[PDB]
């Protein structure tokens, strides 16, 4: 996790 996280 942490790629560019909009969730």
């Keep these: ?3 560019d ?3």
């Design 1 to 3: 996790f942490e790629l």
């Design 5 to 7: 996280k909009d969730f």
